[PDB]
Structure 1
């Protein structure tokens, strides 16, 4: 689907895409290859949809956190720079784009949020979040406000939420330990909600409203990344970039992202893209060209980062980074972000309490792991005749009773529907681990085209167990876990919002309670 003999690049609209296009034209002047740069809306959600069908751009730019999901889905080509090139980037930025032992992207720049403040209104920025209400009272009396920043994207509210103990996935990362609804997360999000309640902030403020308020001098402070500096420069505001305020004595902890460039697994121009990224973009002149459009942050290229680091705005960026944490790149990051976005917005607007909002977000971030735990154990004990002796772990009461419930209602379905199950199991003939990958197509077609309820979910998992028994008999026991993962992916992404609304697997257990 992708045209050969050229390069299409996607990058987000807040980045220096005009600068990126300039590097493209220099590539063109050398090779005769045209370089088109686009910045479509919601490109991080469009990429996986289009690239799954073999379409999309040759190169996609985004912070590294999304790339684990893309690599897991087979959407990114493995990148293979020689040691001479790898030595030119900071080791830690390469780590950010390593997934299951392979490099899946070229790292570009390190991004962290800072506090940006107007030196003509606040010559001394607050060191604590706690003192911002009184400062706002002080500024309101002068016709100004203390602080405005984007409240629609959780990226910007997360520093406050993690400050007192909130976190995504514990530590390696234990995908089973989610820290979205613990006391620390609550304490931070409560402080944000209280700021809104006391008229210090507006739940409706987004990126554009906050940017224009600061850049016109109506608000004294904003929270943003290095890409926003260019527009402040133009407004001629006298701004400083500094450490984020502490909360309850501890630092704000922003999720640090590494802007990175991935090559589409279906692109016919992988040698061209490697040549552009390694020998044109990731060079002193290439990054400067982008940086002059919208600042990149602390770039991954050592030769150039040595000059930018001297800029206090970059030193402040890297100080805020060292207090924060590099984002995971695991595939569940997207699900985490979707959940926390909904929770921050509902809590800020009043649709839910902080308790409600974060509980749902906790159930959403845990949905995939918990579903896989249940579905995999059921499939394997059904196929082998023996249960898994391993502890259930986090939320283990739910999983244990979900599985017990499933044993009850699932075994009755395999018996009563043995005729339909046998027939479906022949139309599909499963003999290979590869065939199991072909299932998702028909599996989704059937599961999607109807109503939603726990009974069809039981059918879904029960045929899964029916198919697992067969795989075991033909010595294909290795295919049962990839089968459990495919069932779980189909279930969680097609019924995410319904399942969260049912209180997840607690609803399951309650719905089929005797």
Structure 2
């Protein structure tokens, strides 16, 4: 099974594995235990297969929403950090790695959508969703649009739909879904109205929105940290800020948490703990990883306060703190497929907002 006396770690290829390897080397210096960092393809798919037979790595890094399923099959070991260590991280990041009342992973980085705008076209971004329609008619007079973002993916339109009370799964309860309530209804109705009023095209997708924003054709867009390097090149003077409110309520974008779990079949659980707590989860630890590839906003308060000197990161955290922690249950798959269809049918007039959400709700709680 899993080798004893060493630590093998799995992390995705789009992360700072080289930097993580650095922290691993430091661990090896003052312990004698070697740390091997690997980044296989479809690791989020392989882990379940190899762990089920008592194999795989000691530690696995992935978005939190996936750990719920791994825990369900008893693949993840329950972690037990003391109160002292727990206070080192933002409170809400812990609700991301909680399953059935147990901590199943260590929070690392936080990710959420923000509002991105062209400072030259819009020196003062809108703080409200209701003022956007008016803003657009003013920008149209100059041949510009006010807002453009991916309307095809629920992930991108959810922030609006949930602002006034909508939600996926109430902290765990798989039978408590909020996609067809008055809140979600209001938000989606506002979105459809923006489309039927020619303020937005129902076919606008990720690429169309990206190219348009980066070419200065639109004043605003909605995206995550993964899109900043692409905008830095376009030579557009942009800023990142908090998302607009709807009916006075903050937009609720889904929150993604990069987390580190420990294989239940690992004989090196104590070493993994020592590594994650006293080596990786430190200012020097996250710095080594960040230097290789930026993590965005981090769950470690001490280091986050330093990275927040970058307003883009500060905003990302602000939007995540007002966002909804993505449910870590497997039923989340029905949600994506259900809401996706509801938004498409509602936008195309094929179905009414009330009907679309009603059918979505039924499919999720089915």
How far apart are 1:63 and its partner, in Å?
3.6
Q: Aligned partners of 2:10 and 2:333: how far apart in 1? A: 19
Q: Normalising by structure 2, what TM-score? A: 0.79
**Residues 177 and 365 of structure 2 are in contact (CA less than 8 Å); yes or no, is this contact kept in structure 1?**
no
**Residues 256 and 327 of structure 1 are in contact (CA less than 8 Å); yes or no, is this contact kept in structure 2?**
yes
Deviations 1:311-370 (A, max 9, x none): 43344334333433334445544443443244334544566543343223211xxxxxxx
**Residues 166 and 181 of structure 2 are in contact (CA less than 8 Å); yes or no, is this contact kept in structure 1?**
yes
Q: In the superposition, relative to structure 1, how do residues 94 and 324 fare at CA in structure 2: closer, same or farther (>3 Å)?
A: closer
Larger radius of gyration: 1
How far apart are 1:104 and its partner, in Å?
0.6
Deviations 1:289-329 (A, max 9, x none): 33345543442223212323444334433433343333444
How far apart are 1:241 and its partner, in Å?
1.6
Q: Secondary structure at the match of 1:62?
A: strand
Task: Name the one with the larger helix percent.
Answer: 1
**Residues 255 and 320 of structure 2 are in contact (CA less than 8 Å); yes or no, is this contact kept in structure 1?**
yes
1:269 alignment counterpart: 268
How far apart are 1:282 and its partner, in Å?
1.6
Q: Aligned partners of 1:327 and 1:47: how far apart in 2? A: 21
Q: Aligned partners of 2:142 and 2:253: how far apart in 1? A: 31
Q: In the superposition, relative to structure 1, how do residues 194 and 209 fare at CA in structure 2: closer, same or farther (>3 Å)?
A: same
How far apart are 1:164 and its partner, in Å?
2.2
Q: Aligned partners of 1:309 and 1:149: how far apart in 2? A: 25
Where structure 2 has 5 or more consecutive residues not aligned to the other structure, the ranges are: none
Deviations 1:123-170 (A, max 9, x none): 111222233334334445545432233334422211101112212234
Q: Aligned partners of 1:326 and 1:6: how far apart in 2? A: 33
Q: Aligned partners of 2:345 and 2:157: how far apart in 1? A: 13
1:75 to 2:75 alignment = yes
Q: Aligned partners of 1:96 and 1:201: how far apart in 2? A: 34
Deviations 1:42-74 (A, max 9, x none): 765665466445565543333433323321221
**Residues 227 and 294 of structure 1 are in contact (CA less than 8 Å); yes or no, is this contact kept in structure 2?**
no
**Residues 345 and 351 of structure 2 are in contact (CA less than 8 Å); yes or no, is this contact kept in structure 1?**
yes
Deviations 1:253-277 (A, max 9, x none): 2233332111233456545544543
Q: Secondary structure at the match of 1:176?
A: coil
Q: Aligned partners of 1:66 and 1:74: how far apart in 2? A: 13
How far apart are 1:119 and its partner, in Å?
0.8
1:331 alignment counterpart: 330
Deviates more, 1:335-344 or 1:117-126: 335-344
Map of 1:339-488 to 2, 5 A cutoff?
339-348=338-347, 352-363=351-362
How far apart are 1:188 and its partner, in Å?
1.6
**Residues 60 and 260 of structure 2 are in contact (CA less than 8 Å); yes or no, is this contact kept in structure 1?**
yes
How far apart are 1:244 and its partner, in Å?
0.9
Q: Secondary structure at the match of 1:199?
A: coil
With a CA cutoff of 8 Å and minimum separation of 6, indicate the structure with the bigger relative contact order: 2
How far apart are 1:106 and its partner, in Å?
0.6
Q: In the superposition, relative to structure 1, how do residues 27 and 235 fare at CA in structure 2: closer, same or farther (>3 Å)?
A: farther
Q: Aligned partners of 2:355 and 2:36: how far apart in 1? A: 45
Q: Aligned partners of 1:513 and 1:329: how far apart in 2? A: 16
Q: In the superposition, relative to structure 1, how do residues 164 and 231 fare at CA in structure 2: closer, same or farther (>3 Å)?
A: same
Q: Secondary structure at the match of 1:92?
A: helix
Q: In the superposition, relative to structure 1, how do residues 65 and 232 fare at CA in structure 2: closer, same or farther (>3 Å)?
A: same
How far apart are 1:182 and its partner, in Å?
1.8
Q: Aligned partners of 2:199 and 2:83: how far apart in 1? A: 52
How far apart are 1:178 and its partner, in Å?
1.8
| Cα RMSD (Å) | 4.3
Task: Name the one with the larger strand percent.
Answer: 2
**Residues 63 and 257 of structure 2 are in contact (CA less than 8 Å); yes or no, is this contact kept in structure 1?**
yes
**Residues 175 and 365 of structure 2 are in contact (CA less than 8 Å); yes or no, is this contact kept in structure 1?**
no
Q: In the superposition, relative to structure 1, how do residues 27 and 308 fare at CA in structure 2: closer, same or farther (>3 Å)?
A: same
Q: Normalising by structure 1, what TM-score? A: 0.59
